[PDB]
PDB file of C-alpha atoms and ligand atoms in Angstrom:
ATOM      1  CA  UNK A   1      95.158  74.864 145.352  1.00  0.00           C
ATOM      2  CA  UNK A   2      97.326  77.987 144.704  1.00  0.00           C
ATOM      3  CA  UNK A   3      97.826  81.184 146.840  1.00  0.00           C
ATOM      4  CA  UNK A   4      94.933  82.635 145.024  1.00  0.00           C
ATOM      5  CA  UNK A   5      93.122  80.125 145.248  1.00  0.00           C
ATOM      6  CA  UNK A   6      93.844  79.920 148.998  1.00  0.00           C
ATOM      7  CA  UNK A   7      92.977  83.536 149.397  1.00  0.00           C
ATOM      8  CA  UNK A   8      89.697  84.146 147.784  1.00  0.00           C
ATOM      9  CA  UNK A   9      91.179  86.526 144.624  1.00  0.00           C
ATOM     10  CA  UNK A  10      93.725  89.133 143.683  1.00  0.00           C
ATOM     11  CA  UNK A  11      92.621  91.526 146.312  1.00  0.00           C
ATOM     12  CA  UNK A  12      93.135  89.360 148.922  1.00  0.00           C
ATOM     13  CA  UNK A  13      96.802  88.254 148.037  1.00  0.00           C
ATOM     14  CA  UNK A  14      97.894  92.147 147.472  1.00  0.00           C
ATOM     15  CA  UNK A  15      96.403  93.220 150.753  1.00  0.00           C
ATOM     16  CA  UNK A  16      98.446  90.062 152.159  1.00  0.00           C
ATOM     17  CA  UNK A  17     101.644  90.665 150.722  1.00  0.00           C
ATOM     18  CA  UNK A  18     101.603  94.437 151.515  1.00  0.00           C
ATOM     19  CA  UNK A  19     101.019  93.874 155.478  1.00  0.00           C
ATOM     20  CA  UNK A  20     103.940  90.957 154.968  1.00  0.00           C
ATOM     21  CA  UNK A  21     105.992  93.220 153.103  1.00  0.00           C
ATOM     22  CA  UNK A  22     105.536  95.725 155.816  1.00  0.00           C
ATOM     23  CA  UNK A  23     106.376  93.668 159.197  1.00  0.00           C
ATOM     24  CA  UNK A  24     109.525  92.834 157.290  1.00  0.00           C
ATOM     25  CA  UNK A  25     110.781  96.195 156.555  1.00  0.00           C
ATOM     26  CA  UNK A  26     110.099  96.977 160.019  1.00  0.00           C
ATOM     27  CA  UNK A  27     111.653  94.192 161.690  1.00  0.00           C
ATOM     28  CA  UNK A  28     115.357  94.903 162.727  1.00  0.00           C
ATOM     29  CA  UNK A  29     115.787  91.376 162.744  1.00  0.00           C
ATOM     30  CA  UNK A  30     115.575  90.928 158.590  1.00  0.00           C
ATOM     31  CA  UNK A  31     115.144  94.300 157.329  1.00  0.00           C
ATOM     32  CA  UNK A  32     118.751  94.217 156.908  1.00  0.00           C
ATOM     33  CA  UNK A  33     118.976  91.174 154.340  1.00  0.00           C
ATOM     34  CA  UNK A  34     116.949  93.281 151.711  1.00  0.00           C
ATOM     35  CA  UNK A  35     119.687  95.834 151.429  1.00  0.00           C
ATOM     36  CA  UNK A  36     120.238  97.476 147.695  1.00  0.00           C
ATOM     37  CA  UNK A  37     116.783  96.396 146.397  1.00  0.00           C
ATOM     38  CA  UNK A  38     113.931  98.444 145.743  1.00  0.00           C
ATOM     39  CA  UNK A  39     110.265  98.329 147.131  1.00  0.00           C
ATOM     40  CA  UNK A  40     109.243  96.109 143.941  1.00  0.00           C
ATOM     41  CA  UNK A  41     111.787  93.382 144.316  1.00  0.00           C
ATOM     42  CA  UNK A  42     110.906  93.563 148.246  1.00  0.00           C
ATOM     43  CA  UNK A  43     107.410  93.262 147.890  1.00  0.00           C
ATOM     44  CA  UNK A  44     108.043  90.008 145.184  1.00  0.00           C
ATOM     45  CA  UNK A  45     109.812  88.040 147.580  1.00  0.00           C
ATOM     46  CA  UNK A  46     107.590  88.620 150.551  1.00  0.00           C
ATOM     47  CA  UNK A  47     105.145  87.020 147.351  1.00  0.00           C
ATOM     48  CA  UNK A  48     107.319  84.586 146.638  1.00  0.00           C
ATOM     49  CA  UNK A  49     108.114  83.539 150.410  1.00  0.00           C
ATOM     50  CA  UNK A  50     104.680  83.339 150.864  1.00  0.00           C
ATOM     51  CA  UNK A  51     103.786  81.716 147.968  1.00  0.00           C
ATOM     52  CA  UNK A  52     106.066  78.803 149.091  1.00  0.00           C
ATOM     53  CA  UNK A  53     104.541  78.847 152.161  1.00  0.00           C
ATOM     54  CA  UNK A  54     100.878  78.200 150.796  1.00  0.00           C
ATOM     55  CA  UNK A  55     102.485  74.851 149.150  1.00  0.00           C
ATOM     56  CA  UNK A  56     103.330  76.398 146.423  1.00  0.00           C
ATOM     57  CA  UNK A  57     106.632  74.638 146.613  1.00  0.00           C
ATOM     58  CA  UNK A  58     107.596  73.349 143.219  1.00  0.00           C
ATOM     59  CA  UNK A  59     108.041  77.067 142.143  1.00  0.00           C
ATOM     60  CA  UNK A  60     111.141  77.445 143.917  1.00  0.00           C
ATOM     61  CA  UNK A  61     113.417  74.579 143.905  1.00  0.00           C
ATOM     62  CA  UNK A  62     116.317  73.459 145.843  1.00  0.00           C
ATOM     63  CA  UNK A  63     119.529  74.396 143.812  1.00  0.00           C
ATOM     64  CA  UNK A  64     117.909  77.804 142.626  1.00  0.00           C
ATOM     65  CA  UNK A  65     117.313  78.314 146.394  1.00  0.00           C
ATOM     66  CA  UNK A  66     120.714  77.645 147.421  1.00  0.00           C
ATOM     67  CA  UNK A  67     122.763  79.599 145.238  1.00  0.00           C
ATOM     68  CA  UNK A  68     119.909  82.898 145.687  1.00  0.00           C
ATOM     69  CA  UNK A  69     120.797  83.081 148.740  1.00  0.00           C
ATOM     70  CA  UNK A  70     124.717  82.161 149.138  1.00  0.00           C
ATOM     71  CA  UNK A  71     125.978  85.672 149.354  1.00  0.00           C
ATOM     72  CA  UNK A  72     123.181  86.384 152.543  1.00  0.00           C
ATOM     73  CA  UNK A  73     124.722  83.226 154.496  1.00  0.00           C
ATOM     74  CA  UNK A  74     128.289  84.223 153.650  1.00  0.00           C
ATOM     75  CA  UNK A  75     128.571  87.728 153.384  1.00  0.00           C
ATOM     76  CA  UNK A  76     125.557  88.896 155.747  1.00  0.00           C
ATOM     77  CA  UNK A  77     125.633  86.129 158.409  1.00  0.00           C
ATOM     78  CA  UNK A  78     121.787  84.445 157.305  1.00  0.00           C
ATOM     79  CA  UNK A  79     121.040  81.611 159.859  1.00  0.00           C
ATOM     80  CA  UNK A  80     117.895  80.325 161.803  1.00  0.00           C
ATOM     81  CA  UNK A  81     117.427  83.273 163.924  1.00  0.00           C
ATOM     82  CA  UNK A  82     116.090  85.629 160.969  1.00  0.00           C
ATOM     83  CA  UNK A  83     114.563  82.351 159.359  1.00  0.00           C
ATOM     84  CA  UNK A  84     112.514  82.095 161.860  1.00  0.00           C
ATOM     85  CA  UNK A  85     111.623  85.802 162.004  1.00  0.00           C
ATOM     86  CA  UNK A  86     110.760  85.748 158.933  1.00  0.00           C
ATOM     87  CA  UNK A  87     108.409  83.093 159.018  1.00  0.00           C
ATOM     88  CA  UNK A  88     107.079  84.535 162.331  1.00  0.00           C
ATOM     89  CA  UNK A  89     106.385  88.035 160.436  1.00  0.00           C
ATOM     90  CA  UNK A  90     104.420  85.946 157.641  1.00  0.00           C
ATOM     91  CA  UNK A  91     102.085  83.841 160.538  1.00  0.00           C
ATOM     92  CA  UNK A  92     101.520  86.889 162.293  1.00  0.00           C
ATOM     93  CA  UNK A  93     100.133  88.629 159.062  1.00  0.00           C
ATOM     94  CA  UNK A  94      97.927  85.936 158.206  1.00  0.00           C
ATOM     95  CA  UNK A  95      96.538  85.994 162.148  1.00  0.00           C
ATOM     96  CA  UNK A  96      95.485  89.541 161.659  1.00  0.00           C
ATOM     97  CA  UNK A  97      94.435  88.966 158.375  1.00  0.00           C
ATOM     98  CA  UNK A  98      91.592  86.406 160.322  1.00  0.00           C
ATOM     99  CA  UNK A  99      92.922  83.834 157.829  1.00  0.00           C
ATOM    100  CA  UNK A 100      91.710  80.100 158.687  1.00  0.00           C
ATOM    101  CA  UNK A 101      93.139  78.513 161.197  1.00  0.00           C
ATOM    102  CA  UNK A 102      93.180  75.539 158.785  1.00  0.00           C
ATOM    103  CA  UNK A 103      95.334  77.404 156.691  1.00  0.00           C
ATOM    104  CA  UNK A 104      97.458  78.746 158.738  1.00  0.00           C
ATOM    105  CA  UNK A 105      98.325  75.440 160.462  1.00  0.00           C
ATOM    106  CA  UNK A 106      99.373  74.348 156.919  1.00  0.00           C
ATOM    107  CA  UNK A 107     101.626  77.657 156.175  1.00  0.00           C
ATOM    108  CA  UNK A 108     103.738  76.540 159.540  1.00  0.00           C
ATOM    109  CA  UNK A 109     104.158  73.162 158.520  1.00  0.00           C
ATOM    110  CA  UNK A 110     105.205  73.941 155.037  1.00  0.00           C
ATOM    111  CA  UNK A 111     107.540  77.150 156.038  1.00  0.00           C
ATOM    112  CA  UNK A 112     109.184  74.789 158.202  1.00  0.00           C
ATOM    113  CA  UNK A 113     110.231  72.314 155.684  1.00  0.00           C
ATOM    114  CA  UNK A 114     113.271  71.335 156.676  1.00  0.00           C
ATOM    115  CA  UNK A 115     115.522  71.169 153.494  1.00  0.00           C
ATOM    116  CA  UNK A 116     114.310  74.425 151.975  1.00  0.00           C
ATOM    117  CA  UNK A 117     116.124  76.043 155.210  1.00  0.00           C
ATOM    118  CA  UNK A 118     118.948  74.106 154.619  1.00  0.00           C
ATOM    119  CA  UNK A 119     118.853  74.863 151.227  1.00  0.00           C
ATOM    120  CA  UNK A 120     118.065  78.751 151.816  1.00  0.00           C
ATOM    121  CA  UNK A 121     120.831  78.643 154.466  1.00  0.00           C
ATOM    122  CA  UNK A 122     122.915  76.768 152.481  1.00  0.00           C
ATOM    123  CA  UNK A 123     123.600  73.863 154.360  1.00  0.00           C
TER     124      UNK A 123
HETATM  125  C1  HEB B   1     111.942  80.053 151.768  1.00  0.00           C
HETATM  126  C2  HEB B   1     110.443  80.087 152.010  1.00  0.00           C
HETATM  127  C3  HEB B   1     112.316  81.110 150.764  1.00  0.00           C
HETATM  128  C4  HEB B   1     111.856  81.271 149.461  1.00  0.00           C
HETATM  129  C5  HEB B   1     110.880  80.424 148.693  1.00  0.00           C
HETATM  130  C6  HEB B   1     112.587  82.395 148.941  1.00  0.00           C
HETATM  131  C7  HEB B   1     112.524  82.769 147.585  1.00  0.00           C
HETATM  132  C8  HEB B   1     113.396  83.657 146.961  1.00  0.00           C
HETATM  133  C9  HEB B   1     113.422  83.877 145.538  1.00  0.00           C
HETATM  134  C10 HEB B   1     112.483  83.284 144.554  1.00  0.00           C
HETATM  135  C11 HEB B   1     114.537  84.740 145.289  1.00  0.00           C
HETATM  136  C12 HEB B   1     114.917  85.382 143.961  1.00  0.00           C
HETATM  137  C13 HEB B   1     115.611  84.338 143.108  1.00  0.00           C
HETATM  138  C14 HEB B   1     115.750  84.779 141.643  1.00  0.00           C
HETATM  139  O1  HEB B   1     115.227  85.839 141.214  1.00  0.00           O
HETATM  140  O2  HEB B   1     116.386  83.979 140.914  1.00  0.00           O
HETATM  141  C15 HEB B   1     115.028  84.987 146.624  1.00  0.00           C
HETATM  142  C16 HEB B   1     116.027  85.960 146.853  1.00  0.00           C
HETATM  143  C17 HEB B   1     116.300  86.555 148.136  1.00  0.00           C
HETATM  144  N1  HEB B   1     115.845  86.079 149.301  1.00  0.00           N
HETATM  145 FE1  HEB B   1     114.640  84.526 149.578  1.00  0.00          FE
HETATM  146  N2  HEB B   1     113.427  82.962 149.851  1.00  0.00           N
HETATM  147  C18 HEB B   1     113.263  82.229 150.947  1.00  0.00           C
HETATM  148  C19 HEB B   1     113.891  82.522 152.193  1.00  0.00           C
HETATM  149  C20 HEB B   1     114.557  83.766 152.486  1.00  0.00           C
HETATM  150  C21 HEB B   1     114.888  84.173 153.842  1.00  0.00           C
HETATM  151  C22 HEB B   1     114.737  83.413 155.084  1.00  0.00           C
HETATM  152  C23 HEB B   1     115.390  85.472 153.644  1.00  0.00           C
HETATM  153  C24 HEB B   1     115.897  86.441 154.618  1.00  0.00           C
HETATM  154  C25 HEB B   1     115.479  86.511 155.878  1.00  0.00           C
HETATM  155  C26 HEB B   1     115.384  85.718 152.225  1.00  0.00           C
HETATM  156  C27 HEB B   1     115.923  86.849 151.602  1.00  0.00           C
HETATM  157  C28 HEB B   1     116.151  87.018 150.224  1.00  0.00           C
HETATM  158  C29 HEB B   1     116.866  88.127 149.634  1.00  0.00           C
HETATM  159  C30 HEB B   1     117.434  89.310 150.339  1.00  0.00           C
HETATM  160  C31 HEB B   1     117.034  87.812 148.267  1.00  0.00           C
HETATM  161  C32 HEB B   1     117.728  88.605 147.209  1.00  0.00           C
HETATM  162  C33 HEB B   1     116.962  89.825 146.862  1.00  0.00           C
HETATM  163  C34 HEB B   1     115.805  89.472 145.984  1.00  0.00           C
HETATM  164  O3  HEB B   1     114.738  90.066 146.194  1.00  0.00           O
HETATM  165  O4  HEB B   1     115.998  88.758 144.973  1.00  0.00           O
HETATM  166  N3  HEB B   1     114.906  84.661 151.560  1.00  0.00           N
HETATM  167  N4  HEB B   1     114.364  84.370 147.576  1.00  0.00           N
END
């Protein structure tokens, strides 16, 4: 089943991304990694991140992963630490969004798939 699906409807997965989208830009942790992009492209990959995270997967695949995010674990020193924040930032939104526990075990499994951090942190 897909995001949506997940969710219960279009209202539900804008309400979720916007409370993502704003732990992240409040988060000194990660804030910092979405530098030079607007509110638009912000709010798509806190989508997108999420999206992944919901099993969604196959949408976002290894070697596209990799090279998106080369110049953050180069140039901007991307490792664990703000992995894990953001991933934290995501959980928590879902907790106060009274999402199923079910559901929410399954997002922290997923999110901590193993080769799409080493393929985010290009490893
Ligand atoms: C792991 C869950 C993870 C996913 C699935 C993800 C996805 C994307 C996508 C789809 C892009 C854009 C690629 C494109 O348009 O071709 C992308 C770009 C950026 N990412 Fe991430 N990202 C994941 C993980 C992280 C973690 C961890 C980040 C930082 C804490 C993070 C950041 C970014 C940034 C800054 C970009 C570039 C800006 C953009 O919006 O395109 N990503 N990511």
């Amino acid at each position: 089943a897909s995001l949506y699906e997940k969710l219960g409807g279009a209202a539900a997965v804008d309400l979720a991304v916007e409370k993502f989208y704003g732990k992240v830009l409040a988060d000194e942790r990660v804030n910092r990694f979405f530098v030079n992009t607007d509110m638009a492209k912000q709010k798509q990959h806190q989508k997108d991140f999420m999206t992944y995270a919901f099993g969604g997967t196959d949408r976002f695949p290894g070697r596209s992963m990799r090279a998106a995010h080369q110049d953050l674990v180069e140039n901007a020193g991307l490792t664990d630490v703000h992995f894990d924040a953001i991933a934290e930032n995501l959980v928590l939104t879902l907790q106060e969004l009274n999402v199923s526990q079910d559901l929410i075990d399954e997002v922290v499994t997923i999110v901590g798939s193993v080769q799409h951090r080493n393929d985010v942190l290009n490893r």
